[PDB]
C-alpha cells in the first residue's frame, strides 16, 4: 500500500510523428541520432518540433522571417523553421537568405532564389551544420488560426471579447438581448 496518485504519471507528449510520411520518417531517423549523440540542445528542439501536428507547426510567412532577420546581431546566420515558408505578397524587396524549412511554396522559392538566396532542407542542414551552429530557429504564428478567437472565456460574459459561433452574420444574428442595453442587458 503506497499513498500516491497515478492520475498524471503517464506524460502526454509525442514520441514519434503520427504522420506516415516516409521522408518525414527518414528525417526523424536522422535527428534521433543527432539529438542523443550531440550535446547541442538545438537538435532536441528540432526533434521535438518534427513530431508535432500541422496545427502546431504553422506556416512562417516570408515577411515575418525578413522582420526577424533584420535584427542586429544576425544577417550571417541561417534561417531554420520546422514548418513551411509561404510567400508574402505585401513585401517588395527581398534580401538574400539562407533558409532551411520542411517545405517551401512554389512562389516563395522563386522569390527567394531570384534574390540570390539559398534554400536548404534538413538533411543538408545537418551536413552543413550538425550542432546547429549559427542558425536562428523560428516559428510561425501559432495562435494565428481562426479557431482561437472562439476560445477563452465564453461570450455573454463581462469583458469576454470572444467570437461566438453563428451560422451567418447580420443584423439579426446575435445582435439582440445579450448585446444591447436596450434589450434586457449587456456585458
Amino acid at each position: 500500500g503506497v499513498d500516491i496518485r497515478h492520475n498524471k504519471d503517464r506524460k502526454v507528449r509525442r514520441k514519434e510523428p503520427k504522420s506516415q510520411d516516409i521522408y518525414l520518417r527518414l528525417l526523424v531517423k536522422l535527428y534521433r541520432f543527432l539529438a542523443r549523440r550531440t550535446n547541442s540542445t538545438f537538435n532536441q528542439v528540432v526533434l521535438k518540433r518534427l513530431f508535432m501536428s500541422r496545427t502546431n507547426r504553422p506556416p512562417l510567412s516570408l515577411s515575418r522571417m525578413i522582420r526577424k532577420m533584420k535584427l542586429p546581431g544576425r544577417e550571417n546566420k541561417t534561417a531554420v523553421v520546422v514548418g513551411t515558408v509561404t510567400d508574402d505578397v505585401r513585401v517588395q524587396e527581398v534580401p538574400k537568405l539562407k533558409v532551411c524549412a520542411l517545405r517551401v511554396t512554389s512562389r516563395a522559392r522563386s522569390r527567394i532564389l531570384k534574390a540570390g538566396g539559398k534554400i536548404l532542407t534538413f538533411d543538408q542542414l545537418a551536413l552543413d551544420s550538425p550542432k546547429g551552429r549559427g542558425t536562428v530557429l523560428l516559428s510561425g504564428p501559432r495562435k494565428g488560426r481562426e479557431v482561437y478567437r472562439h476560445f477563452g472565456k465564453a461570450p455573454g460574459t463581462p469583458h469576454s471579447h470572444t467570437k461566438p459561433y453563428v451560422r451567418s452574420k447580420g443584423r439579426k444574428f446575435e445582435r439582440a438581448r445579450g448585446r444591447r442595453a436596450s434589450r434586457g442587458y449587456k456585458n
Binding site: 517588395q92 461566438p164 439582440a176 434589450r183
Partner: protein
C-alpha cells in the same frame, strides 16, 4: 470505416457507453432548439448572447448586387499588375507612372492598409477612403475616379 468506430469496442459492455443510471432515452431535454426561454436558459446566455429579439430596420427586397463593393488594400495593390510593370517604373527616368486599373482586377473600393513603395501610380478605381487617398498622394501618385 465501421471497424475504426467506437461501437466495436463497446460490444459486451451493457449500457453501450451511455450509463446505467441515466439511460439513453429518446429525448430528455426536448427536440431541436427547445427551452430557449426555459430549462435551457443558461446555455443560450452563456454561448449565444443576443439570440432572442429584434433590432434594426426590416429591408424587404434585398438585392445583393446593389450593395456590391469588394475592397482592396494598398498593401497588395501592386499585385494587381505584373512584376514587369513594377520594375520598369523604378528603372524609368521620365517619371512615367503606371496606371493600375482596380476595377479591371475586380475590386471597387481602395482602402489604405499599409505601406507603399515610393513610386507614383494613377489608380483607376471607383471609390477611395480618406487615408487611402493620403498614401497615394504622399507617395506622389494620383487618385482618378471612374464609373
Amino acid at each position: 470505416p465501421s471497424r475504426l468506430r467506437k461501437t466495436r469496442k463497446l460490444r459486451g459492455h451493457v449500457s453501450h457507453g451511455h450509463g446505467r443510471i441515466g439511460k439513453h432515452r429518446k429525448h430528455p431535454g426536448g427536440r431541436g432548439n427547445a427551452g430557449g426561454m426555459h430549462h435551457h436558459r443558461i446555455n443560450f446566455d452563456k454561448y449565444h448572447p443576443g439570440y432572442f429579439g429584434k433590432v434594426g430596420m426590416r429591408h424587404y427586397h434585398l438585392k445583393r448586387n446593389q450593395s456590391f463593393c469588394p475592397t482592396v488594400n494598398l498593401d497588395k495593390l501592386w499585385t494587381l499588375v505584373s512584376e514587369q510593370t513594377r520594375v520598369n517604373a523604378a528603372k524609368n527616368k521620365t517619371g512615367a507612372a503606371p496606371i493600375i486599373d482596380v476595377v479591371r482586377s475586380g475590386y471597387y473600393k481602395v482602402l489604405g492598409k499599409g505601406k507603399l513603395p515610393k513610386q507614383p501610380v494613377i489608380v483607376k478605381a471607383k471609390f477611395f477612403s480618406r487615408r487611402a487617398e493620403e498614401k497615394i498622394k504622399g507617395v506622389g501618385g494620383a487618385c482618378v475616379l471612374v464609373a
